[PDB]
């Protein structure tokens, strides 16, 4: 009573958004060059690229991590398409990085500048870990992680066995580098970001059949992370959470592919660690589109004020990688709770992420990928271009749109499962059934499934009946059934089945208004799972399609004061009642409800708002705490806006892509987080490149007011002796430090380098703000 999981290759989508952003996603994928993709590589074996690398990402230290994302969405796309085209790009960027393989003869493959001397001194045991660095070199674990990934995605999904073969010499050539590497030695090179290298070498277990490679998978496993998730204890305050989720995504594997290994007894723990990680990241670290964390980073489940303030809202990677590990959740859900039949309640997230998110963070008719989606009322996000971006939210976007068939149906035996809604033909040679499933949801309540081919099997279709949605047709004849639940079920449906039958259901959906998980005032709209939002404005869209700068996956645009943004008046169930749906064969609503300032609103399924500002999440206000609540709005928020409108450049420090996208060095330097900001400091020194657009006059510096450390600021290495207004301490303790600086920085560039002031270290810095 084992569930399994249908090819791409045998789920053919039909016309709807699914497809339509497929096609999108085709197109973006072939315009890329392949020659300077594979450059990087060619570069690190001692050959002569044939074209310069793409700059962005990928000639700033990250080179050679779209070259695997690409390996991977080409032989997704080719399984799901066919497409010649794709062929010939797989085919081409298999052959140059075998050539690069062969050239240096060890199984090595790798773009990260000055790779081979890197992983010489890791085999030596020199070994310089940061958060985000390992030996100089930004995650390089990460970026190779990319490449074992795209291979054995070369090989499982386009049948290669060329990169089957380069798939085993490279992780061959991985256990030589950690051979005479301890375990605290790994555990402590694993603190850098290292993807999810513990996954692919469990892949490479099961493609072998061979226990040494779930040796070194084990061996790549983060223990401070997995320990406690082993023990339901969620720690994931503070941390960079696009790093956590590979990792976890590799505990469960590794738990799958030891499911008979009698040498080692913890598959149970991996996997129980992996499925609390799940619940607890959708049920306190998510918001209504699926997705988790603000400038990367978890903040406190009980505070999601930075996730409504901030325009750096959740990163499209993360729910990539929760889909990831939600497949493989369900999978083997009903061996887990012993009912031998998969939970649909995970499902109902695969849905709610898939549509809100992943639908809707890429551009639908050129194409462009999101790296941020804010939750902030009145603010937009930021689409990728082929040839300027090189982001892991395009890396993650290349293979977002190849593979919606894969999650559709799920077969155990003679049971069929029914999950997503989206029309798609499917070839269930098993049982010997080709199947159409027509719909126009979420536009039309209404779903069709047709046997267009059959083998008169006995076989029970488990139609998915959500918690937010019984009458069934089936050839013209109703037959009615009772709710056992009112929680997310499954319908049976046993018949044999024959060419010409039609199963026809109804999917009732209602709004629902979703408050905030952390119980503040503000609230996003739903009609049955699709999050509806409001277009606020069409102005300041700034860099909505990036150029290659670093920081260009940001929405940079002026920031709206809130109290300019529509407030819902009134209580919740009022609220939600004031919601009518438009007349059409799409989804629209009007809100006809007292709205401050008044702009009636219109309100449309959040994946179709594209090129414009938007709210997703109101907020609301009592009729009784108005006035309290609009004052607040009027003077704090409204200053906060003028001050980030006022800011030239803005760094995080301790957070690894501010700190990356401004150039970070360092010497005896480290990070962490108090009272949920980070800081960097250090007793040698850090330095970053102010980006200076327009002419700044002042510079602002945080630190706690009770550290006694002190920081001298150099700019371009001439100290700063101005003395600064101190502002008055926050509620946490944070003081504000505001240099007047004696000339204006010019328009470009400017070192700003920090160095202890007598003091042991540096003060902890918690921001870097320069100001017009
Ligand atoms: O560090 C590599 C990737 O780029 C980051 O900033 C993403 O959040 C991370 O997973
Ligand atoms: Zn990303």
């Given at each position: 009573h084992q569930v399994s999981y249908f090819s791409l290759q045998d789920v053919k989508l039909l016309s709807s958004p699914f497809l339509q952003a497929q096609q999108t996603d085709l197109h973006y994928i072939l315009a890329l060059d392949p020659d300077r993709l594979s450059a990087p590589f060619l570069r690190e074996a001692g050959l002569t690229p044939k074209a310069p690398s793409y700059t962005n990402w990928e000639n700033t230290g990250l080179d050679g991590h779209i070259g695997g994302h690409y390996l991977s969405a080409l032989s997704m796309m080719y399984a799901a398409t066919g497409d010649t085209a794709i062929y010939h790009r797989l085919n081409y960027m298999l052959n140059e990085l075998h050539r690069a393989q062969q050239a240096v003869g060890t199984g090595f493959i790798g773009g990260t500048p000055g790779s081979l001397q890197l992983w010489k001194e890791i085999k030596a045991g020199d070994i310089r870990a940061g958060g985000f660095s390992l030996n100089g070199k930004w995650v390089p674990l990460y970026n190779i992680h990319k490449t074992y990934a795209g291979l054995r995605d070369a090989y499982l999904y386009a049948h290669s066995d060329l990169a089957r073969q380069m798939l085993i010499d490279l992780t061959d050539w991985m256990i030589d580098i950690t051979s005479g590497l301890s375990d605290n030695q790994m555990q402590d090179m694993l603190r850098?970001?290292?993807?999810g290298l513990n996954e692919t070498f469990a892949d490479v277990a099961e493609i072998t059949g061979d226990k040494k490679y779930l040796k070194l998978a084990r061996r790549f496993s983060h223990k401070v992370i997995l320990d406690p998730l082993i023990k339901n204890?969620?720690?994931?305050?503070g941390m960079h959470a696009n790093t956590q989720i590979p990792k976890v995504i590799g505990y469960k594997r590794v738990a799958e592919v030891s499911?008979?290994?009698?040498?080692?007894?913890?598959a149970a723990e991996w996997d129980h660690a992996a499925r609390f990680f799940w619940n607890t990241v959708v049920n306190h670290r998510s918001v209504c589109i699926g997705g988790n964390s603000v400038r990367e980073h978890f903040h406190p489940?009980?505070?999601?004020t930075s996730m409504l303030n901030?325009?750096?809202?959740?990163?499209t990677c993360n729910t990539y990688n929760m889909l990831r590990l939600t497949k493989m959740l369900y999978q083997n859900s009903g061996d887990v709770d012993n009912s031998n039949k998969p939970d649909p309640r995970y499902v109902d997230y695969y849905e709610r992420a898939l549509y809100n998110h992943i639908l809707s963070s890429?551009?639908?008719?050129?194409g462009g990928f999101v790296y941020f989606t804010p939750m902030r009322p009145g603010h937009y996000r930021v689409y990728s271009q082929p040839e300027t971006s090189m982001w892991c939210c395009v890396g993650s976007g290349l293979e977002?749109?190849?593979?919606?068939?894969?999650?559709?149906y799920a077969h155990q035996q003679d049971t069929l499962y029914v999950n997503l809604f989206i029309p798609s033909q499917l070839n269930w040679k098993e049982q010997g059934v080709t199947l159409t499933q027509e719909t126009l949801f979420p536009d039309d309540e209404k779903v069709t499934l047709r046997?267009?081919?059959?083998?008169k099997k006995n076989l029970t279709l488990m139609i998915r009946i959500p918690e937010w949605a019984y009458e069934i047709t089936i050839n013209g004849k109703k037959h009615l059934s009772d709710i056992?639940?009112?929680?997310s079920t499954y319908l049976p449906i046993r018949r044999k089945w024959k060419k010409g039958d039609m199963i026809t259901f109804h999917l009732p959906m209602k709004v629902s208004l979703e408050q905030i998980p952390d119980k503040k005032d503000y609230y996003a709209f739903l009609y049955g799972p699709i999050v509806l939002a409001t277009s606020t404005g069409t102005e300041n869209?700034?860099?909505?399609?990036?150029?290659?700068?670093?920081?260009?996956?940001?929405?940079?645009?002026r920031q709206t004061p809130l109290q300019e943004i529509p407030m819902l008046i009134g209580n919740p169930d009022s609220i939600r009642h004031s919601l009518h749906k438009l007349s059409g064969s799409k989804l629209a609503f009007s809100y006809d409800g007292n709205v401050y300032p008044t702009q009636s609103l219109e309100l449309i399924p959040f994946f179709r708002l594209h090129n414009s500002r938007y709210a997703v999440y109101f907020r609301q206000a009592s009729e009784e705490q108005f006035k309290t609540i609009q004052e607040e709005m009027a003077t704090a928020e409204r200053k906060a806006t003028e001050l980030a409108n006022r800011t030239v450049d803005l760094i995080f420090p301790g957070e690894q892509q501010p700190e990356s996208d401004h150039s970070i060095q360092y010497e005896a330097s480290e990070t962490g987080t108090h009272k949920d900001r980070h800081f960097r400091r250090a007793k040698g020194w850090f330095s970053y490149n102010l980006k200076i657009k327009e002419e700044a006059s002042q510079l602002m510096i945080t630190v706690r007011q009770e550290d006694r450390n002190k920081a001298v600021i150099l700019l371009n290495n001439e100290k700063l002796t101005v003395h600064p207004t101190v502002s008055k301490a926050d509620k946490d303790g944070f003081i504000r430090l505001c240099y007047l600086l004696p000339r204006k920085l010019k328009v470009g560039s400017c070192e700003i380098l920090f160095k202890p002031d007598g003091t042991e270290?540096?003060?902890?810095?918690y921001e870097v703000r320069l100001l017009k």
């Open positions: 850098s970001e290292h993807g204890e969620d720690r994931l305050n499911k008979n290994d009698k040498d080692w007894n913890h489940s009980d505070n999601f901030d325009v750096q809202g959740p990163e890429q551009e639908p008719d050129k977002n749109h190849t593979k919606y068939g894969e999650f559709i046997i267009d081919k059959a083998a056992q639940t009112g929680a869209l700034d860099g909505i399609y990036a150029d290659d700068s670093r920081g260009g996956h940001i929405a940079h645009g270290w540096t003060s902890a810095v």
